[PDB]
Amino acid sequence: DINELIIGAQKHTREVAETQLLQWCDSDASQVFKALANVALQHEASLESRQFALLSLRKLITMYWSPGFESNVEIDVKDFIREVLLKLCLNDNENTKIKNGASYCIVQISAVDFPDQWPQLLTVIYDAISHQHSLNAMSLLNEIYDDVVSEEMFFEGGIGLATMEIVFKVLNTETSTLIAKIAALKLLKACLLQMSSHDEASRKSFVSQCLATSLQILGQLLTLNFGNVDVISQLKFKSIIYENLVFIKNDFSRKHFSSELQKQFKIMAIQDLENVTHINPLLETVHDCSIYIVEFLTSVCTLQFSVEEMNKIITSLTILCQLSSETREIWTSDFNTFVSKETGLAASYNVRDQANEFFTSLPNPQLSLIFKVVSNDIEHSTCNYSTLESLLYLLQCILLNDDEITGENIDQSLQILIKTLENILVSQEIPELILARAILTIPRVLDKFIDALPDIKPLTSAFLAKSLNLALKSDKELIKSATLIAFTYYCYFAELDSVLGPEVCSETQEKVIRIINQVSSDAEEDTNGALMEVLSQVISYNPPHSRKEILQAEFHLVFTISSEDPANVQVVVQSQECLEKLLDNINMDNYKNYIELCLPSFINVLDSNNANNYRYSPLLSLVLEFITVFLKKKPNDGFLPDEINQYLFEPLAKVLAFSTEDETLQLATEAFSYLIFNTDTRAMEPRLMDIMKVLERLLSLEVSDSAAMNVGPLVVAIFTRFSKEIQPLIGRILEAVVVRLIKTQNISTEQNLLSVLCFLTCNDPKQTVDFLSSFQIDNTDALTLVMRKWIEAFEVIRGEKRIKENIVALSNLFFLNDKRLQKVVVNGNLIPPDRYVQVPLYTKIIKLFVSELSFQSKQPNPEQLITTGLMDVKESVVQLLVRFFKEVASKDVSGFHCIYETLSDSERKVLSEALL
Numbered sequence: 001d002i003n004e005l006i007i008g009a010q011k012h013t014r015e016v017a018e019t020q021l022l023q024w025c026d027s028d029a030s031q032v033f034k035a036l037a038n039v040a041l042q043h044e045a046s047l048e049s050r051q052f053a054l055l056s057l058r059k060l061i062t063m064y065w066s067p068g069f070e071s072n073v074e075i076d077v078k079d080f081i082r083e084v085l086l087k088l089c090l091n092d093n094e095n096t097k098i099k100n101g102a103s104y105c106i107v108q109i110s111a112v113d114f115p116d117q118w119p120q121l122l123t124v125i126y127d128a129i130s131h132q133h134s135l136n137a138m139s140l141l142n143e144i145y146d147d148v149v150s151e152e153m154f155f156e157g158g159i160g161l162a163t164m165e166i167v168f169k170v171l172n173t174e175t176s177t178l179i180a181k182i183a184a185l186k187l188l189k190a191c192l193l194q195m196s197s198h199d200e201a202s203r204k205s206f207v208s209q210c211l212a213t214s215l216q217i218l219g220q221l222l223t224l225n226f227g228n229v230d231v232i233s234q235l236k237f238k239s240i241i242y243e244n245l246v247f248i249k250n251d252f253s254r255k256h257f258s259s260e261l262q263k264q265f266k267i268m269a270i271q272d273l274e275n276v277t278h279i280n281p282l283l284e285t286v287h288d289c290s291i292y293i294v295e296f297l298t299s300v301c302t303l304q305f306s307v308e309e310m311n312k313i314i315t316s317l318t319i320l321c322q323l324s325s326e327t328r329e330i331w332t333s334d335f336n337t338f339v340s341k342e343t344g345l346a347a348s349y350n351v352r353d354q355a356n357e358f359f360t361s362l363p364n365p366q367l368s369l370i371f372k373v374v375s376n377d378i379e380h381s382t383c384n385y386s387t388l389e390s391l392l393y394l395l396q397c398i399l400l401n402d403d404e405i406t407g408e409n410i411d412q413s414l415q416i417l418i419k420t421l422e423n424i425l426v427s428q429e430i431p432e433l434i435l436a437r438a439i440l441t442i443p444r445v446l447d448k449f450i451d452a453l454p455d456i457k458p459l460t461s462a463f464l465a466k467s468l469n470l471a472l473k474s475d476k477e478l479i480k481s482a483t484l485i486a487f488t489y490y491c492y493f494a495e496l497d498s499v500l501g502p503e504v505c506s507e508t509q510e511k512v513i514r515i516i517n518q519v520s521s522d523a524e525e526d527t528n529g530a531l532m533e534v535l536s537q538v539i540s541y542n543p544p545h546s547r548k549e550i551l552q553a554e555f556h557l558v559f560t561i562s563s564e565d566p567a568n569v570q571v572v573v574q575s576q577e578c579l580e581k582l583l584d585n586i587n588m589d590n591y592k593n594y595i596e597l598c599l600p601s602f603i604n605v606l607d608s609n610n611a612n613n614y615r616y617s618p619l620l621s622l623v624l625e626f627i628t629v630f631l632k633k634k635p636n637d638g639f640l641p642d643e644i645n646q647y648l649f650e651p652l653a654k655v656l657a658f659s660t661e662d663e664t665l666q667l668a669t670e671a672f673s674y675l676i677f678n679t680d681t682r683a684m685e686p687r688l689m690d691i692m693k694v695l696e697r698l699l700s701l702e703v704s705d706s707a708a709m710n711v712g713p714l715v716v717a718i719f720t721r722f723s724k725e726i727q728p729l730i731g732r733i734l735e736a737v738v739v740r741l742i743k744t745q746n747i748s749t750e751q752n753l754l755s756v757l758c759f760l761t762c763n764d765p766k767q768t769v770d771f772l773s774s775f776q777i778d779n780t781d782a783l784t785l786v787m788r789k790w791i792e793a794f795e796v797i798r799g800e801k802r803i804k805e806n807i808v809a810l811s812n813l814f815f816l817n818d819k820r821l822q823k824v825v826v827n828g829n830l831i832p833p834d835r836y837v838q839v840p841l842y843t844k845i846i847k848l849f850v851s852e853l854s855f856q857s858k859q860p861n862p863e864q865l866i867t868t869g870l871m872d873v874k875e876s877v878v879q880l881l882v883r884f885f886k887e888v889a890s891k892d893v894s895g896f897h898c899i900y901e902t903l904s905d906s907e908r909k910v911l912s913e914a915l916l
Helices: 002-007 012-027 030-041 047-064 075-089 096-117 121-131 135-148 151-155 159-171 178-196 201-221 231-251 259-277 283-299 307-320 325-333 335-342 351-359 364-379 388-399 410-426 432-448 456-473 477-493 502-520 525-540 548-564 569-582 588-610 618-631 642-658 662-677 681-699 712-721 723-743 747-763 765-772 782-794 800-814 819-823 841-857 877-891 893-902 905-914
Strands: 825-831 835-840
Touching: 002 012, 002 030, 002 047, 012 030, 030 047, 030 075, 030 096, 047 096, 075 096, 075 135, 096 135, 121 135, 121 159, 135 159, 135 178, 151 159, 151 178, 151 201, 159 178, 159 201, 178 201, 178 231, 201 231, 201 259, 231 259, 231 283, 259 283, 259 307, 283 307, 283 351, 307 351, 307 364, 307 388, 325 335, 325 432, 335 477, 335 525, 351 388, 364 388, 364 410, 388 432, 410 432, 410 456, 432 456, 432 477, 456 477, 456 502, 477 502, 477 525, 502 525, 502 548, 525 548, 525 569, 548 569, 548 588, 548 618, 569 618, 588 618, 588 642, 618 642, 618 662, 642 662, 642 681, 662 681, 662 712, 681 712, 681 723, 712 723, 712 747, 723 747, 723 765, 723 782, 747 765, 747 782, 747 800, 765 782, 765 800, 782 800, 782 819, 782 825, 782 841, 800 841, 800 877, 819 841, 825 841, 835 841, 841 877, 841 893, 841 905, 877 893, 877 905
Parallel strands: none
Antiparallel strands: 825 835
16 A cells, blocks of 8 residues: 555656645544555665655644644554654764755754653664764754743753753864764854853853853864865864854953963964965865854954964955956856946855955054055056956955054055056056946045045046946946946935036046946846936936926836836835925926926836736836826925816826726825825816716725725815815715715724714715715715714724814814714613613713813823824814813803703713813
8 A cells, every 4th residue: 555655656646645634634643654654664665655655644743743833633542652763863874865854844843842752862863873883863953042042951950061061072072073073063053042142040050160161172172174075074174163263252251362372273263274275166165164264363353463474364355255267257247247246235245345344444553554455465466367356356445444554654555556547547467356346445445545546526527538448338237337436426416516526526426427328228126226226326416506307317227227127126216306406496387397307207117007907017107106296296386287187187187097006006096186186176077977986986985994094185185276176066975975984883983084074064064964964874864874883983993193183073073063863873882792871972072072181181191202183283182172162151052051951970070160
């Protein structure tokens, strides 16, 4: 049965069984496992079937073992399955796919079962390591550690001390294999991690002693000198030692790593940086090893470095930071790879990155002195085109140290260094990657040394002009891109409109604009975002004295690049600022030309997106934001020109008539409302019947609750600008708001719509009560249902502006003294499936107002932060309430004398105190 039952499942024939069999276990699981387990136990099997048996087992377990998070199996078959798993996994002689397979099941069982359902799991593993010499048990312990050794088991449970003494025993034995010392060192790091997440007093003796023993053992370990016997394991040995050293130095206080211990390891580490580079797949074994050596030197880089120690370091990093020929070819074959790296947007982390962390960490006794060490090495290497890029990059790291560089004859050095960088860009047969590094390194020289170059103004203008000049007559987009990037490094420290001429600055705008236009045709994602950033800095330097064409070129770039990568986060952010700087502080006459330059592109995107039913589309969302940025840049004095309305209206309307996507509806709603609120009324006059159909549909059930909640400001806009002609359509606005409001049960959405209702009752309280007291909803008049829902919402409202607009609205209903309102009843008190004493609307309004006024005049809580809605109300809630009560008291409004005698004494004191 079961063996050839999966001979198939391990391609119609696979699923015959893979659900065939899943069936079985749900029927009887306890001895489909035992059957599955039994096949893994049997050495009489294709390592393939055994291996899949274990990994088929593997997935299986986390279902029926013990929920678990996605579930039936008997208690003594699991004891069997754990013991079979320990047999396979802890035996070094077994096949390393059986071991890992068995190790996978064990690690999942442990997660569910360990504390109380596998008590000896660790004592077995510890005994396997120390008395059965199991190497794989060390590996299982290491994968188990994170997820099953808790903080508490580590320290009081004795697991941390048991581990550390095992670790120490392997590393102090001259006869444990280097492979076993690696396993011990990886356990050591696991232990350091558990000790890094700490505070309780009884632990501090344990931690202090494990750190001290660790530091002495790692010192003796770094003095072994194997042969060429296995250098990939040799280098994985060294890198895990230096990784542990880094971790001790960085996550424990300095009493635990004395500066003299630091000085020993600094020396061993500088030596091993030399050893590792003078042997040198293998290269990323030695490259990744040297990352940890350098990481440690970074971590003790406040120590002093003998001059000779620094030349050692610089010659080793010069070799290590040289670009591999694979990476040179990737960069020269797709320049977007080079942009991705140099803009920091690459996921890589290599020796060059770690060197940058070293050089930008140096304090200033050492930082200035490496400066000439590298500056000499650059002079003694101007024709070695195998080390010069790397040396320039080390220079770049040093210059990125935020600290200043000064020393005995550093001005000498600089005039020398300045005077080989200009020969890089004049030199005509210079390799592409080295020219780019020189281009990107020049601004950082001029930035770091600006206070020590009297010629800084013409120096920069020439260096920059030379670089645009290469870039435009180089065919290499990598060189162009290095220049675009370098241009931003010049802006960082230099205000170009003053350091250059008004005329030259204007001509370097045109020159990076067309460099951008050359790179853009071939640009992928990270480098489109960098083009947008460059463009916005170009836009910054726009001249008052207008220039028709350069503006048109900038916006064309903004729009086409954004159409290329509308989901890239930098494109989205930088293009909106680009647009905000173009229409920043612009007059009405220029506005009229921007309308023709800008809007027809935006309407194309919206036109195209109807094909897609205005479903979510990142360029749609981005172009709607462009539109809103355009509208809101109109001169404060004036209306939107009439052209804006006739360009934008039925495009935006269509979006709102068909889209069902919350972000699209919300961005279009606010653009549309704003267009209605800010164009002349006679321009908008024929559109109102259409604005209504938009509004009715945004309250229909075709759109979500949160789409209904954007309607507020559209209602405002059509009253605020169709005041005369809205009056015969108020009844439809109201029916729309009302049928929606009663169909929703989300309290927050009710409030949003009640807000619109508050606006509508204030505008005409009678017509509201009339409509609502003639309009029928499910057999009864709306009046009762709405008012009850209104009151229930008012009771849990929040926000000063919301409270006021409801107070004003309901105050207007009270002052109606309406025959019909007086007769409706809302819910008062719970009576002991549930019931409530029925309360007249009117006296419930009084009751609620007195409670608000009681709470609101118990004056503030001492501490605070300092010193929405559709209607603007200036009075405090307290002022609104006292002015209301004073007036209904003064004239017996709507039976107030009756209501007021039904009030309690408590309520009644509140009333006459506030009215004192």
